[PDB]
Amino acid sequence: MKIAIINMGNNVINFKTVPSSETIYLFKVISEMGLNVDIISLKNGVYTKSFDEVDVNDYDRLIVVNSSINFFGGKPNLAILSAQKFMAKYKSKIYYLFTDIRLPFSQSWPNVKNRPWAYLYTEEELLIKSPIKVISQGINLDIAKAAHKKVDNVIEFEYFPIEQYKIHMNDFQLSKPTKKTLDVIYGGSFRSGQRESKMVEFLFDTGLNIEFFGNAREKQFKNPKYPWTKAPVFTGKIPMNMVSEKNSQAIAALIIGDKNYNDNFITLRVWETMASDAVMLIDEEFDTKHRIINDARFYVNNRAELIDRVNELKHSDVLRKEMLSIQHDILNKTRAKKAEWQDAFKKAIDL
Ligand SMILES: O=c1ccn([C@@H]2O[C@H](COP(=O)(O)OP(=O)(O)O)[C@@H](O)[C@H]2O)c(=O)[nH]1
Ligand SMILES: [Mn+2]
Numbered sequence: 001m002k003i004a005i006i007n008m009g010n011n012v013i014n015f016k017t018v019p020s021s022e023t024i025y026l027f028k029v030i031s032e033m034g035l036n037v038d039i040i041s042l043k044n045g046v047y048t049k050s051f052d053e054v055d056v057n058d059y060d061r062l063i064v065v066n067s068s069i070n071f072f073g074g075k076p077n078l079a080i081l082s083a084q085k086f087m088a089k090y091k092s093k094i095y096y097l098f099t100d101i102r103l104p105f106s107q108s109w110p111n112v113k114n115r116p117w118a119y120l121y122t123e124e125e126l127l128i129k130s131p132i133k134v135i136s137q138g139i140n141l142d143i144a145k146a147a148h149k150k151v152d153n154v155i156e157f158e159y160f161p162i163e164q165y166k167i168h169m170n171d172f173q174l175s176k177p178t179k180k181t182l183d184v185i186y187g188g189s190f191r192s193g194q195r196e197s198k199m200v201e202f203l204f205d206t207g208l209n210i211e212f213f214g215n216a217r218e219k220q221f222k223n224p225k226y227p228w229t230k231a232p233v234f235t236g237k238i239p240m241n242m243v244s245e246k247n248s249q250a251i252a253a254l255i256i257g258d259k260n261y262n263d264n265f266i267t268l269r270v271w272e273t274m275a276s277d278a279v280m281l282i283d284e285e286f287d288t289k290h291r292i293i294n295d296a297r298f299y300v301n302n303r304a305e306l307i308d309r310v311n312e313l314k315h316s317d318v319l320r321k322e323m324l325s326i327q328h329d330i331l332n333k334t335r336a337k338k339a340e341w342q343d344a345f346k347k348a349i350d351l
Contacts, residue, residue, distance in 0.1 A: 001351070003030065003037040004059035008087075008105075009067030009080040012041040012048055021240035023065050026097070029165040030063075033342040035351075042082060051082050056090045061349055063095045066103040069111065076117050081126070084108045088128045095349050096154075099137045099162050099268075101260050102194065104147040105154060129153060135160050135348050138264040160348045161341070163268040167275065167331065168338045174328055175277040178248040183208040183310050185250035185278060186232075187243060188269070189215040191258065196223050198256040198283060202306050204228040211235060213246060248277035251313050251320065254306075255282040255292075262286050274331045279313055279323045281306060293330050297323060 005027055006012075010019030024047050027039045038059075041048040056062065064087065069080050084107075087094060096105045109126040112118055133156035136144040141157045148154045166172070186203055190196075200221065203210055210232035218231050238246055247253045253273040257265060262285050270292060273280045282292060284301040292298070300306040313320045 001036060001061070002059045003035055003061045003063060003349075004040050004054075004056065005030065005037055005063040005065065006040045006083055006086065007065045007067055007079070008083045009069055009077070011079045012039055013045050014047070015239055015241050018237075018240050019065075019067065025165055025169065025240075026063075026065060026162075029168060030345075032168075032170055033345070035346075040086065042078060051086045056086050057092075059090075060092075061095065061351075062087070062090050062092070063097060063349065064105075065097050066100055066105070068103055069106050069108045071111055071115060076115075076120065080108055081112075081121065084126050084128060087130070088126055090130050092130060093156075093350070094128070094130050094132045096132055096134050097162055098134050098144060098147075101138070101143070101147060101258060101265070102191070104144075105132060105134065105151055107151065131155050133158065135162065137162050137267070138261070140264045143260050143264060158348055160344055161266060162345075163266070164271065164334065164341055166268060166271045167335050168341060172275075172335070174275055174331075175244050175248040178245075178277040180249065180251055182211050182250035183314065184210040184232075184252050184254060184281075184306070185213070185247055186210075186254040186256075187213040187238070187246060190217070190220045193220070193223060194258045195256060196221065197226050198285075200226040200228050201303050202254055202256060202283065202300070203232045205230050206232075206303060206307055208307065208310055211250070213238060243272045244276045247273055250278045252281045252310055253278035255280060255286060257283075257286050263288055266292065271331070274327050277324065279320060280327050281309060293327060295323075295326060298327065 007019055007023045012020045012023045015021045023039060027037055030037045039048045040051055040054055044050050071077055109123050112121055132154045134144055134154055136157060136159050138144055139159045144157055203212055205228050212232045213235045214237050218234050253276060255270055255273060257267060280298055282299050284299050300309055
């Protein structure tokens with residue numbers, strides 16, 4: 001049993017970039033459950049083998065981490081093109097890890113055939129014809145199927161909480177008590193405005209000391225539907241492996257998602273936040289049944305409640321420590337089910 005894992009649209013080298021980090025974490029968690037796996041990328045490296053130096057059909061299972069396949073100006077993006085050429089040569093089922101609703105599997109040929117450099121490729125070379133199984137992070141498979149209605153060879157769908165991988169790593173460690181410098185914190189990108197309403201609601205005009213780290217910038221928030229006056233402080237992005245430590249700088253950390261994530265996706269940030277020294281505050285809409293933690297104090301319905309909850313935490317250090325103890329306890333209860341999680345992953349990839 002030989003497994004190959006690749007990122008469909010981002011080069012993989014080390015932990016200096018997020019897509020690379022995620023692919024390496026998955027390679028590691030899969031290796032940690034006793035499986036033989038190789039990461040195949042553009043060139044040979046510490047964690048990778050080159051597409052040009054291996055035969056894709058020498059692998060019994062091909063796993064693909066979701067990515068965008070959009071092309072912009074300039075030279076051909078080989079991270080996308082070489083990955084799809086590799087996939088096109090595979091003669092068995094492909095397992096697509098679908099962790100972001102906006103990144104469904106899609107054929108690149110349609111987006112290539114019109115480009116000025118289109119002559120460098122052929123349909124036969126890029127057209128992926130193998131059957132594809134989508135492993136969905138979201139429990140609602142209808143939302144996953146709708147995202148793939150344009151691709152004909154995607155014939156199987158199965159739910160699996162892929163992003164729990166961060167808490168199951170052999171070197172996992174809870175964040176320790178940290179000197180606080182912020183009231184509320186949130187790390188992420190602008191996600192093309194797919195979550196602007198919630199970001200403005202909970203992070204803008206709160207009167208609190210809030211920081212928004214990641215690729216997002218203040219000037220991106222200009223949707224007339226969601227006006228604001230005072231924005232949180234925006235700082236640059238940090239390595240993925242430093243996220244929980246960053247969250248720990250604040251008294252509380254926010255959990256929000258895209259509309260289609262509500263009561264559907266339990267994202268990586270849930271785990272990065274739960275494991276941090278920051279109290280996890282969740283948008284009520286994101287988890288209406290309180291399945292993450294059965295304690296209403298961890299949920300906020302709107303800006304007003306977030307402000308009240310944060311001030312209650314600032315006022316009582318005991319309340320803060322108590323809630324932190326509760327969320328760390330719940331996190332460990334899930335880590336205690338690692339065996340079941342590993343077995344479910346193996347089943348998802350037909351092992
Ligand atoms: O500076 C940053 C900000 C974010 N992240 C990662 O990006 C994720 C959030 O991605 P996104 O903004 O797409 O939000 P999501 O839809 O995952 O909630 C976080 O959980 C981290 O893993 C990171 O590594 N560095
Ligand atoms: Mn995500």
